[PDB]
Write a protein that binds this DNA or RNA. Structure first.
Ligand SMILES: [K+]
Ligand SMILES: [K+]
Ligand SMILES: [Mg+2]
Ligand SMILES: [Mg+2]
Ligand SMILES: [Mg+2]
Ligand SMILES: [Mg+2]
Ligand SMILES: [Mg+2]
Ligand SMILES: [Mg+2]
Lengths: 135, 87, 200, 163, 131, 81
RNA sequence: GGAGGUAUGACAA
RNA sequence: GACGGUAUCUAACCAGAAAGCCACGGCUAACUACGUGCCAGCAGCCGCGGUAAUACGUAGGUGGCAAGCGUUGUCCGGAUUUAUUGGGCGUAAAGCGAGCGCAGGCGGUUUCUUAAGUCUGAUGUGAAAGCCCCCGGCUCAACCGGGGAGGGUCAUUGGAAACU
RNA sequence: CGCGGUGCAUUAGCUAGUUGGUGAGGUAACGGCUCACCAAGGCCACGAUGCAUAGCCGACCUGAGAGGGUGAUCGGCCACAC
């Protein structure tokens, strides 16, 4: 471009965006608007717990939960690990991160936080999946 | 009132002070016009640094120190010189 | 944090005698573990860099952040060579001073003497093994602690000391007499690899 | 231009396993790029191919010895900034200060360490193909100059030029 | 048209240099005369001569080669394009190739080199580098 | 001797107003990023004492107290009709 | 010698 | 003298009361055994798992950090991936289907003139704290303090005017 | 008062005490600050008006720099007190 062009219209950068828009918003019941807040984790209520079939190179029953967030955005997350204490209406805590198998799951569920029971008999990579030491 | 006082610096339980020219309306640490020395008693005696010319100029222009600063300026001989210059 | 673990294990991973003795490599000069003696495969340049860095911090029992900050403070210097100044600043640590003066058999022993407070600098107690030491100071065993038999054994079992030091046995005081030198340090290390490592 | 009477030592940039295809499947060969030098100014590179890693290495070394070039130096630094282009690989190299060491992560680091340039600031702008980045590197080091040469061309003296 | 005769002059030099021609002819102006004289007395050119014709003074150049083959000039480059003009201070004076080339500057004193400018502690408009 | 209040030189563009005019300065700042020497046609309102100045005429103006809401400047000269 | 025009094939590997 | 019989110093005693987190297919430093058998599960990207898994889970072992470690979320960089520094438009993304022309952008040679741009001397200010340099005190360090340096498409005045 | 610092033109027209003047009043003080009277001017593609967003700054994080992002703690100016 010519410098005249670059003054008549400047370089307008490639607009960016997040891999987790649901975490980057909030809600005040008074004015009832999306409040933009950069929150690492959130709370939600599992509105469904089920299984899904992953993409073609893989084959499995991937455990998901559809969840109703504090900010009233409904979100599909993954239940990592082996086993869960979850049901519909079960309070849950959510963190970010894709699950490359299904597309519609941009989020993960956290273990050891709330009604989510810690994983059972997991001794390695233990902070992850949230289960206390075997003494 | 325009005043010549001392403002607090340094960590807790290890204080230090800067003599300073401050209005009484400003905070303990805030607006100031000029610094004219500094102070700490953390030595076995007290220990002092001063700027005689500027502090005497503000005293002439109408300053009004606090009690401890008056003691310090007495030990450094500035109040006596101001008195003499008024005589 | 401090390392309470084995010495020989570290030394024989790295493939070098840190104590300058040999029995931390003698009879088993291969990395630990049941994949130790068998045919190690190729290794990478990142591996070599990391190994050089780990040699030094395992010598001096140091932490990564201390290491990094000391590297930065050496970088702030312009009057010499970068990694050589880094090694010198490592040498100016009481852990190593006590060792080079022959006042203790190991850097762990030396650190323990320093921290337990059996040592003085210019006649003042110091429980800080990371204490920097400028050329000209006077390290000295605590005049009450000169009676321990451990240090007397360690001092009368002293081989010929380095060139950059001065020391007396009756006084149990010594000091640096130089920057100190580079080549008088362990030439087994390639400081350029640390430089490339932390240039990243 | 002669590798004779020199202590050329080598270093392998990369081995790219590279395939030809036949009715009977795939004919897998190894292609290697090697850079060799004496750490005095004289450096070269070579391409080798073979069904074996060491054979391709040998061939590349023997081709690199036959394609040497000499880089100037100024206290383990190059004289002036330069941009080298060779078909997708742009590299700019700047004269750096002493003690700053090298600023590259291979293959350029290998090329310059073997040529003897201990202190330099470089950057790969374009592609990442080792072959063409190395070729742009040598092209830039060929663009480089010597003060004596330039002053003998211009007629002016060395001090009369640098000022 | 000729919206930049200085750069036309520089590029004509570059083209003749690439084909290894021996001489040039250009519709000249006083700034071209200054630049040609600077190159003459700095070593990038063998010789330069003038021609006075009614429309405009032509200036002819006689280029320089270390041999039949080797070139003294490698490449030139204008910086004040003029779409973005490059004015610089006595500290921001460029140093073409750490002193192995030359920058051509116009200042209150006149058309001079980076040498003279960075010595006198002046600056001005930069109009050409020469590798 | 006392200070000297700011003065500008400019050009007239409208004289349809009594005891006052509009004046244009035409500096040239360099665009902050891309550096190009741009135009910048700042303009002002000047108090004319006598409705002397004519359109498209060069002029000088010195600041002063607000003589109106827009006005901040005082005519000094008339230079080129 | 060369140029311009004149029916279906499971998924993954 | 609230802190406070706290800091601090002395002496007696016990190795005794005081180390875990993540990762180990490649990018990336770090490897085997057993179970499981496209299931369970892993996964930052490439991708692992279908009866011999260094990629799941456990055990052993090792590596990186260490009273912290790992993970998410946010900002920068790498990203020259909005290119002033510092990119491109024949085929990859892109030359409007083509022209007439207001405004603006740019503009042949040259004398004289100005001095808006430009260059430049001096003066002032750019608070302190902070970054940086030299010092010094806290058992060193963080930190704290002193002194200095720098910072403005900054302003007034005074010159040149080669170039616009 | 000069200058400067954010996005949209899928926002192109905006203003009427608004613009200026002669008086008078009014404020610590200048002046449409206010009233009458006279005139119809004034702002804008160098982005007015409108919409959204936001306290600004010293400074902080990053970066080769150019720049980007932020404006917590400390200090300064501003604004607010259901
Ligand atoms: K495993
Ligand atoms: K606000
Ligand atoms: Mg590996
Ligand atoms: Mg895992
Ligand atoms: Mg198995
Ligand atoms: Mg296309
Ligand atoms: Mg300051
Ligand atoms: Mg960058």
């Amino acid at each position: 471009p010519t410098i005249n062009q670059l003054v008549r219209k400047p370089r307008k950068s490639k607009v960016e965006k997040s891999d987790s828009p649901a975490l980057n918003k909030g809600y005040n019941s008074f004015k009832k608007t999306q409040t933009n807040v950069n929150s690492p984790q959130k709370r939600g209520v599992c509105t469904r717990v089920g299984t899904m079939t992953p993409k073609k190179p893989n084959s499995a029953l991937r455990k998901y939960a559809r969840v109703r967030l504090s900010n009233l955005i409904e979100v599909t997350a993954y239940i990592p690990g082996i086993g869960h204490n979850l049901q519909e209406h079960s309070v849950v805590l959510l963190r970010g991160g894709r699950v490359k198998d299904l597309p519609g799951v941009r989020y993960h569920i956290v273990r050891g936080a709330l009604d989510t029971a810690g994983v059972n008999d997991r001794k390695q990579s233990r902070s992850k999946y949230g289960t206390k030491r075997p003494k | 009132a325009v005043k010549i006082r001392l403002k607090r610096m340094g960590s807790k339980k290890s204080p230090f002070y800067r003599i300073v020219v401050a209005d009484s309306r400003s905070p303990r640490d805030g607006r100031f016009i000029e610094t004219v020395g500094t102070y700490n008693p953390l030595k076995d005696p007290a220990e002092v640094v001063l700027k005689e010319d500027l502090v005497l100029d503000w005293l002439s222009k109408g300053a009004q120190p606090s009690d401890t600063v008056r003691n310090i300026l007495s030990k450094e001989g500035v109040m006596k010189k101001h008195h003499e210059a008024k005589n | 944090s401090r390392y309470t673990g084995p010495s020989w294990k570290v030394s024989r991973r790295l493939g070098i005698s840190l104590s300058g003795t040999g029995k931390e490599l003698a009879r088993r000069p291969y990395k630990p573990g049941q994949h130790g003696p068998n045919s190690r495969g190729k290794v990478s340049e990142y591996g070599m860099q990391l190994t050089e860095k780990q040699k030094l911090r395992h010598m001096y029992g140091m932490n990564e952040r201390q290491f990094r900050t000391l590297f930065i403070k050496a970088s702030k210097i312009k009057e010499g060579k970068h990694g050589v100044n880094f090694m010198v600043l490592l040498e100016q640590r009481l852990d190593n001073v006590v060792y080079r003066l022959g006042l203790a058999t190991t850097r762990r022993q030396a650190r323990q003497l320093v921290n337990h407070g059996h040592i003085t600098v210019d006649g003042k107690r110091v429980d800080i093994p990371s204490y920097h030491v400028e050329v000209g100071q006077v390290i000295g065993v605590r005049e009450k602690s000169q009676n321990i038999s451990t240090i007397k054994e360690a001092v009368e079992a002293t081989v010929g000391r380095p060139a950059f030091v001065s020391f007396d046995t009756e006084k149990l005081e010594g000091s640096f007499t130089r920057l100190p030198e580079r080549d008088e340090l362990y030439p087994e290390i390639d400081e350029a690899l640390v430089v490339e490592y932390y240039n990243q | 231009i002669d590798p004779k009477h020199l202590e050329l030592e080598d270093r392998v940039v990369a081995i790219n396993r590279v395939t030809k295809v036949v009715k009977g499947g795939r004919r897998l060969r190894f292609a290697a790029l090697v850079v060799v030098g004496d750490k005095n100014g004289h450096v070269g590179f070579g391409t080798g191919k073979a069904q074996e890693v060491p054979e391709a290495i040998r061939k590349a070394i023997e081709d690199a010895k036959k394609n040497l070039v000499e880089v100037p130096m100024v206290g383990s630094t190059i004289p002036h900034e330069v941009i080298g282009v060779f078909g997708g690989g742009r590299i700019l190299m700047k004269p750096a200060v002493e003690g700053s060491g090298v600023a590259a992560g291979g293959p350029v680091r290998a090329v310059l360490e073997l040529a003897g340039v201990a202190d330099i600031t470089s950057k790969s702008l374009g592609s990442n193909t080792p072959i063409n980045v190395v070729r742009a590197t040598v092209e830039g080091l060929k663009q480089l100059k010597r003060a004596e040469e330039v002053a003998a061309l211009r007629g002016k003296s060395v001090e009369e030029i640098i000022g | 048209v000729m919206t930049d005769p200085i750069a036309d002059f520089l590029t004509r030099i570059r083209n003749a240099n690439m084909v290894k021609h021996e001489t040039l002819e250009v519709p000249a102006s006083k700034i071209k005369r200054d630049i040609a004289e600077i190159l003459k007395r700095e070593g990038f050119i063998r010789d330069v001569e003038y021609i006075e014709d009614d429309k405009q003074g032509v200036i002819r150049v006689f280029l320089k080669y270390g041999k039949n083959e080797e070139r003294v000039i490698t490449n030139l480059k204008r910086i004040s394009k003029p779409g973005l003009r490059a004015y610089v201070k006595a500290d921001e004076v460029p140093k073409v190739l750490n002193g192995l080339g030359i920058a051509i500057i116009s200042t209150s004193e006149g058309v001079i080199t980076d040498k003279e400018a960075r010595a006198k502690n002046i600056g001005g408009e930069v109009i050409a580098y020469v590798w | 001797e006392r200070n000297q209040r700011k003065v500008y030189q400019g050009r007239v563009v409208s004289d349809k107003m009594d005891k006052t005019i509009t004046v244009v300065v035409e500096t040239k700042k360099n665009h902050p990023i891309y550096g190009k020497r741009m135009k910048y046609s700042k303009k002002y309102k000047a108090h004319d004492e006598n409705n002397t100045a004519k359109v498209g005429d060069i002029v000088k103006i010195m600041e002063t107290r607000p003589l109106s809401a827009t006005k901040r400047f005082r005519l000094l000269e008339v230079v080129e009709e």
